[PDB]
Amino acid sequence: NLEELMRTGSYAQITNMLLNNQPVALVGALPFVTDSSVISLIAILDATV
Amino acid sequence: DAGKVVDSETASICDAIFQDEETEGAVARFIAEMRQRVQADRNVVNYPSILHPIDYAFNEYFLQHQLVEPLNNDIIFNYIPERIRNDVNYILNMDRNL
Amino acid sequence: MDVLYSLSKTLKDARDKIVEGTLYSNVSDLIQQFNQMIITMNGNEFQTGGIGNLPIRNWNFNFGLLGTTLLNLDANYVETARNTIDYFVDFVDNVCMDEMVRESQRNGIAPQSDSLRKLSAIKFKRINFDNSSEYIENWNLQNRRQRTGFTFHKPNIFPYSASFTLNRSQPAHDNLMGTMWLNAGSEIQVAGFDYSCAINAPANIQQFEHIVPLRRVLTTATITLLPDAERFSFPRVINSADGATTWFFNPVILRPNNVEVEFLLNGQIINTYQARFGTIVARNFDTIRLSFQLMRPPNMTPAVAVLFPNAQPFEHHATVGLTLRIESAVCESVLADASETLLANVTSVRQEYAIPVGPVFPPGMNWTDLITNYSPSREDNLQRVFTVASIRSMLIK
Amino acid sequence: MDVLYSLSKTLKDARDKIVEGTLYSNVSDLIQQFNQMIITMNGNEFQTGGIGNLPIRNWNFNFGLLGTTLLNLDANYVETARNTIDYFVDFVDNVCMDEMVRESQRNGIAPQSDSLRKLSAIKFKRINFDNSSEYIENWNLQNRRQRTGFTFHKPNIFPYSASFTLNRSQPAHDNLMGTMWLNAGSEIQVAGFDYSCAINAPANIQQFEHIVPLRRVLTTATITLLPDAERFSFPRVINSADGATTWFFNPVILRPNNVEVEFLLNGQIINTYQARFGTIVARNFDTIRLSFQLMRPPNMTPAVAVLFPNAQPFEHHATVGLTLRIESAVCESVLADASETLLANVTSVRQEYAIPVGPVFPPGMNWTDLITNYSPSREDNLQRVFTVASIRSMLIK
Amino acid sequence: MDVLYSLSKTLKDARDKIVEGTLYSNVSDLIQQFNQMIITMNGNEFQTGGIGNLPIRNWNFNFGLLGTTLLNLDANYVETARNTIDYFVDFVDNVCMDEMVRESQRNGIAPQSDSLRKLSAIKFKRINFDNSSEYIENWNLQNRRQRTGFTFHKPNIFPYSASFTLNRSQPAHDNLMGTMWLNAGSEIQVAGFDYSCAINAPANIQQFEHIVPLRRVLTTATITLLPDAERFSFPRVINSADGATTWFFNPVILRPNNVEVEFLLNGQIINTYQARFGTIVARNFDTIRLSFQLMRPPNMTPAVAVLFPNAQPFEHHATVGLTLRIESAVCESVLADASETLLANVTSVRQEYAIPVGPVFPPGMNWTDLITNYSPSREDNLQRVFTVASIRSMLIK
Amino acid sequence: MDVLYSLSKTLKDARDKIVEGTLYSNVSDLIQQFNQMIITMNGNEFQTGGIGNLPIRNWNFNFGLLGTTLLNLDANYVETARNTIDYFVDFVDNVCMDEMVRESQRNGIAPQSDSLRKLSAIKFKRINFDNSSEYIENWNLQNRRQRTGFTFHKPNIFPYSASFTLNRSQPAHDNLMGTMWLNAGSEIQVAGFDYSCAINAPANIQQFEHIVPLRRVLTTATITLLPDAERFSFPRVINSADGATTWFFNPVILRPNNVEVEFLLNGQIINTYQARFGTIVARNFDTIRLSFQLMRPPNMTPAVAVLFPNAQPFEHHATVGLTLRIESAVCESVLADASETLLANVTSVRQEYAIPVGPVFPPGMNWTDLITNYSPSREDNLQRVFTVASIRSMLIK
Secondary structure (H helix, E strand, C coil): CHHHHHHHCCCHHHHHHHHCCCCCCCCCCCCCCCCCCHHHHHCCCCCCC | CCCCCCCHHHHHHHHHHHCCCCCCHHHHHHHHCCCCCEECCCCEECCCCCCCHHHHHHHHHHHCCCCCCCCCHHHHHCCCCHHHHCCCCCCCCCCCCC | CHHHHHHHHHHHHHHHHCCCCCCHHHCHHHHHHHHHHHHHHCCCCEEECCCCCCCCEEECCCCCCCCCCCCCCCHHHHHHHHHHHHHHHHHHHHHHHHHHCCCCCCCCCCCCCHHHHHHCCHHHCCCCCCCCCHHHHHHHHHHCCCCCCEEEECCCCEEEEEEEEEEECCCCCCCCEEEEEEEEECEEEEEEEECCCCCCCHHHEEEEEEEEEEEEEEEEEEEEEECCCCCCCCCEEEECCCCCEEEEECCCEECCEEEEEEEEECCEEEEEEECCCEEEEEEEEEEEEEEEEEECCCCCCHHHHCCCCCCCCCCCCEEEEEEEEEEEEEECCCCCCCCCCHHHHHHHHHHHCCCCCCCCCCHHHCHHHHHHCCCHHHHHHHHHHHHHHHHHCCCCC | CHHHHHHHHHHHHHHHHCCCCCEHHHCHHHHHHHHHHHHHCCCCCEEECCCCCCCCEEECCCCCCCCCCCCECCHHHHHHHHHHHHHHHHHHHHHHHHHHHCCCCCCCCCCCCHHHHHCCCCHHHCCCCCCCCHHHHHHHHHHCCCCCCEEECCCCCCCCEEEEEEEECCCCCCCCEEEEEEEECCEEEEEEEECCCCCCCHHHEEEEEEEEEEEEEEEEEEEEEECCCCCCCCCEEEECCCCCCEEEECEEEECCEEEEEEEECCCCEEEEEECCCEEEEEEEEEEEEEEEEEECCCEECCCCCCCCCCCCCCCCEEEEEEEEEEEEEEECCCCCCCCCCHHHHHHHHHHHHCCCCCCCCCHHHCHHHHHHCCCHHHHHHHHHHHHHHHHHHHHCC | CHHHHHHHHHHHHHHHHCCCCCEHHHCHHHHHHHHHHHHHHCCCEEEECCCCCCCCEEEECCCCCCCCCCCECCHHHHHHHHHHHHHHHHHHHHHHHHHHCCCCCCCCCCCCCHHHHHHCCHHHCCCCCCCCCHHHHHHHHHCCCCCCCEEEECECCCCCEEEEEEEECCCCCCCCEEEEEEEECCEEEEEEEECCCCCCCHHHEEEEEEEECCCCCEEEEEEEEEECCCCCCCCEEEECCCCCCEEEECCCECCCEEEEEEEECCCCEEEEEECCCEEEEEEEECEEEEEEEEECCCCCCHHHHCCCCCCCCCCCCEEEEEEEEEEEEEECCCCCECCCCHHHHHHHHHHHCCCCCCCCCCHHHCHHHHHCCCCHHHHHHHHHHHHHHHHHHCCCC | CHHHHHHHHHHHHHHHHCCCCCEHHHCHHHHHHHHHHHHHHCCCEEEECCCCCCCCEEEECCCCCCCCCCCECCHHHHHHHHHHHHHHHHHHHHHHHHHHCCCCCCCCCCCCCHHHHHCCCCHHHHCCCCCCCHHHHHHHHHHCCCCCCEEEECECCCCCCCCEEEEECCCCCCCCEEEEEEEECCEEEEEEEECCCCCCCCCCEEEEEEEECCCCCEEEEEEEEECCCCCCCCCEEEECCCCCCEEEECEEECCCEEEEEEEEECCEEEEEEECCCCCEEEEEECEEEEEEEEECCCCCCHHHHHHCCCCCCCCCEEECCEEEEEEEEEECCCCCECCCCHHHHHHHHHHCCCCCCCCCCCHHHCHHHHHHCCCHHHHHHHHHHHHHHHHHHHHCC
């Protein structure tokens, strides 16, 4: 849960799970950007957000 | 948890520790977990504080030897010296509760 | 190998430390250790079993970190920790059972089961809490080739051996004279029997000599000495070495004379004790030698002269017995001891899943054959399996 | 329940760690625990004693906090610590003694005395420290229905019953064929005797059988098997079954052959060992059934023709025996051991004040009669008393 | 003394817990304590050896300080830590071996070697890590004039003596009635023998008594009692005190009736047991007194009717046997047992350098000669040497 | 476990209360629980079956939510609820019938079926409405280690063993003296008989003892007792114990004299009853000992004098009568009775789908054979099966 980590402030788990390349699944009320650009999908962009 | 702290400098220290990119997350979570718990049925409250042990000992000693004392109407009624109340030629009267 | 012991120790500490009511500062190091363990162990899948009747299970650690509280814990945090503790103890038990049932002639110091080898990489070395137990300390010190040992109480070291020797023999079997011994378990019982009562031997005294070797040396051992044989003093019908005919035995016990107990090292005299009985101490030895004399009594009352005449026929033979019992000792190599349930756990895990006799251990985990053919490779394998069993015996009581 | 163990642990740690000169960064958490316990334990009155000869005691707690500002413990700090520690030790000792002797046939896994009942409420739960010993952690594991374990060394599990049976008998007791066995402690010596040496029985082989039912369940037990009875070999004058006559015994020992030892669980064969004397190992069993054989030797020597005459008279009889001992075992219930002093502790504390007893515990904690009939309520009460004794042994020697 | 134990515990902690990969937060207290110990011990000179054949060695403490900066420990950290640890542990072991080889007939509670004498100064009292060990805790308790205690498994406390006393004697030694016993180790075997089976004694019943005192105060002892003693259940030929007389003893074990045990302390009755067997227990006793009756069976069979003639010519004598074994007990003084390696280690170290016999300890550390003349000063010296030996046992495994 | 019962209770209350024309303010809690359950279970996959003939079915929860805003439930809402209710009841019936027939030789109290294993996770524990039945309360209190109890009417605890015992016997059965008993179901019927009618006896009084043990303890028992045997008072001919011959029984009933019944626990007297013949109560017992004496009539009429001759040949044989019945009891372990529909349901759901005989339960679910060897593992398995049966017994009756 993103809000739990944010309020608690313990960032170690998500940082390790992002740096060491292990699959995860964040859950939280998050707005998203609609991408109607296939070229933007080809040049991988959903890996630096 | 939207807690409150004891001193402004304590708040400054908490902000400094909470925001330092070289610090781990366990201490930050402990900082975020601080919250005052109030128990008004026994007239006691708890607050968080950060001090050197000497300062904490001094603060505890100040806290646990306060000079207050519960007040009641009969206590003030007995606060007058006895050789005035016992006599009849003088009569005492109140006009407010406590 | 160290990672498994770290897991066992930290699991015991987490189970027996995190109880409702304790102050937060009492579990700070343990909480951080558990956090690091969860960080390191998540993601890396593992597989256990694959051999025998042990089921082939899978493991994929999917647990989050633990919380905290400033004043005192709450039971919800306790149960959240407890579920992860249950998963980890199940995993540790399964991997220990997998490690127990693999062995080979090649160097046994290296891990055998794939789970331990995958755990023993550099990538998971950060989770190494402490090495405070006995077997783990022995393992670590033996890794660096230093002085090593184990604490033994009533060590079950000597093999089962029931044999006898003869000095003079007759086909009629009525004039026997020799030594009979039984060294079973930690107890050594040696009896020297004569039928002629030394009426023909020079100086009227018969000498009996007995020798027993020891595979692995002992240090600072304590041995009690009793000048009797409370076991080899019954009438007996003992089978002869022929295999089809038996001879008769009838002992009478006299007080032994000139009892000499010897402790030698590679054929060098080290410790000698004359006419002493009780709890004695030997500095170091690897072989045991006993010498004593049977002396015909100088004066014979009728109840004695009835049994030991100058004539040929005898019916009440004479024998003097000696008792040797080892109480405690420290040995350089690991030996099956009686104060711990390590051997029982090892054989239970070996026999549950129907693993046939391997190329090293004798069938049925029988101790006598294994200890009769002790070898350094077998020593290393036994040390490894004992350490694994000790790690396993910490979580499932 | 765990609060008393926590008090014992914190008192012991304070007594063996609060010594002048130590660095303050080594006992900070322990001092915090001590201060919080003192804060939580102030102002509550307690009444202890009032049953039997045990004196009635009263306890009041009113003390200030310790010091936490020094960096090197000095004479004053340790002096005050010991001054309060003595009072706490007296409190723990008296509370444990008062709560120990009391017994009940209902809910023998709940607090029984006023002190424990008042000290197990919600408020006094913030003093639990750790569960580092074995008995208390076993208590905790059994409380929430987890697998139970206990390590014993030569424990008194078999009862005491010196009874014998005869298969072929005579009205004058001159020609007998039967079995004897002395079952005591953790030792089983069963002996079979045939006067006629199986001259009337088919195939010249006589079979003796015996069954020893254990009163509970064991696991991972090591057994030493000495193939010679140490007892049923001396001349005897033994009273018969009817108690009206006594008969003579002149045994002679012959080695047993085809020795079968079996360990059965839930009325089913689990482990089978044949003709292997020395060390044997079993994983889990509940009933020990032993079957051995005695065979008349085919050919004999001049010293043997006088032993077993086929004629009418009989004075020396073929006898065999097996020695079965347990050197270590692990059980799920609690039993009196030989390596610790639990049963001795409870017996001493009970006999010191002579508490009147009902139909709860056997008279005077007679272990043999206790093992005779074993009801689960007795088991729970005994486990609770043993745990309280273990807590007591931590502080007062 | 306690300073040495603190150093030993700190050295063990540094040797064990300092491993690659562990979090530095887990050993911050340990590293601070280690740095403090290095600071305190630096810049001093100590000497060892000089008496007997102990190699004289000289130590100078010039050492650095371990860093307190690395987030995660690395290899060079471990190598430097072990570089310091080897010298520290060598110094500790040599100090212990030098302390063990010197004794004082008076004031044994005080240091004797130069090293412990120097360490008694208040300056070196800055290292008091803990006192968790039981022996060191007992030493501290003894240092403040307070009650102590110990727990032992089968402690050899009985003096070693082998003698027999006759009540009725004849020069020809064919009509005797007396008591035979052997007090060896922790087991007592007492057998009363009569040659007439009470044919002339009043009421056909013979009364037997036997007394064995003790030199210390045992407490809370679990005692196993079994009938029909082992060692005295086969024929014997035993010499007498006359120096020229030898007699024969043919035992036939009758059945014992009305077994009476009496545990006495300071000439008073504390525990009394009658007609009970199996496993018993006494709270506090100082001496053991046994009483039993040898009863002639009024009803007999012919096989028995020939065994006991009604005339002086006797073919078989009669006796009964009793075994007493102390499984577990609690004592207040240091005692050598069968489940530890303290006295054995002390004797091994004494004989390793061949120290000449001192004025107090009997030559060769003969346990029986030590216990036959036990003295409180010898007790205090033994406690000191056992504590230092236990300190030694924490280093070399 | 408890989750399944909570779901069953929710479904049962939904069946009872969701009818057209009710008020919403009476079933609000039930509707809230139903909505929470349907939210939790939505989006999961299940597998059921595997053994015997139970089909392999896949279940998915995909039902929509239920509104709560209407003040009165109408037909549309009724059918909308009923469809999902029927689906859920079919699912729970399937999972229960899967779990009932599976058992394990070890750890039988734990779940074994796939569905029950899956429904024991952490999140699903957020659905637990009520535990109001007796069996669920018993299970919950047993899991929390407190006093358990199951009510019964006519508990079927006595094993079926119709055995007769003879003491004074002849090869032709001309004069007998012994006991014949029938202990079947919840009734005990015994009868002591003598062919001599105590005519050559010691003072015309012959005793008969009968001891009947119980595998499990009982509490709070009301006993119905009558002095007349209702089965052993008729002319019968039964085959003897030789296996190839038959003997005749000719009874004449007298009244039993000195009718003593003993209810003993753990070899201690608990209650005694003499000269009372029914509606007696004993509080706590485990073992029942019935004894009585048969007495010759002190005076007789001519008919009785002719019937009983002082000579050897007898026409009629005297016999006494006694019958005991247990009415109500409460036990600590689950049992079977004649007032519960659980055993029948278990046997039906077992034999309907042809389950092969398991490793613990003897084939056919025979109750006498099962109770003959009542074992703790059998106790746990029976408890699990009966609890699941009781849970099912409310979904569809």
